Amino acid sequence: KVFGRCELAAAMKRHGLDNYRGYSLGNWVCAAKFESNFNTQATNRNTDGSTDYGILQINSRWWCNDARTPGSRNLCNIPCSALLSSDITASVNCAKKIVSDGNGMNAWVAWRNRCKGTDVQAWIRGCRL
């Protein structure tokens, strides 16, 4: 499912992401925009053999099991396919663990490079939240 900007903002807020670990909603929406372009079905394989899954492009080396990433850790205890669902709950619960991991949202390279230090509020502007 391809989310609309405000549609995603509301679902994320509803799932407790607004200000989670100090990161405003604009940050999460900006990250989803540049990571998957709001598409739950997005996947991207990496050179080390791992794959990034879903709306927040969660990596298989540490966070989920795809049975094809040697060395993988499955810290979120979920098969990676679960991250491709239209219901963002799984992606959100795993993201909460990642952002609590110690590096904050810098764990998402697109956030660090295209959201960090920008007016992320613009991503939630105009939305009825």
Swiss-Prot record:
It is found in: Secreted. Belongs to the glycosyl hydrolase 22 family. CDD domains: LYZ_C. InterPro entries: Glyco_hydro_22, Glyco_hydro_22_CS, Glyco_hydro_22_lys, Lysozyme-like_dom_sf. The gene is LYZ. It catalyses: Hydrolysis of (1->4)-beta-linkages between N-acetylmuramic acid and N-acetyl-D-glucosamine residues in a peptidoglycan and between N-acetyl-D-glucosamine residues in chitodextrins. PROSITE patterns: GLYCOSYL_HYDROL_F22_1 (PS00128), GLYCOSYL_HYDROL_F22_2 (PS51348). Substrate binds at D101. Monomer. Residues 1-129 form the C-type lysozyme domain. GO terms for cellular component: cytoplasm; endoplasmic reticulum; extracellular space. This is Lysozyme C. It comes from the Eukaryota. The active site is at E35, D52. GO terms for molecular function: beta-N-acetylglucosaminidase activity; identical protein binding; lysozyme activity. The lineage of its organism: Eukaryota, Metazoa, Chordata, Craniata, Vertebrata. Keywords: Allergen, Antimicrobial, Bacteriolytic enzyme, Disulfide bond, Glycosidase, Hydrolase, Secreted, Signal. It comes from Gallus gallus.
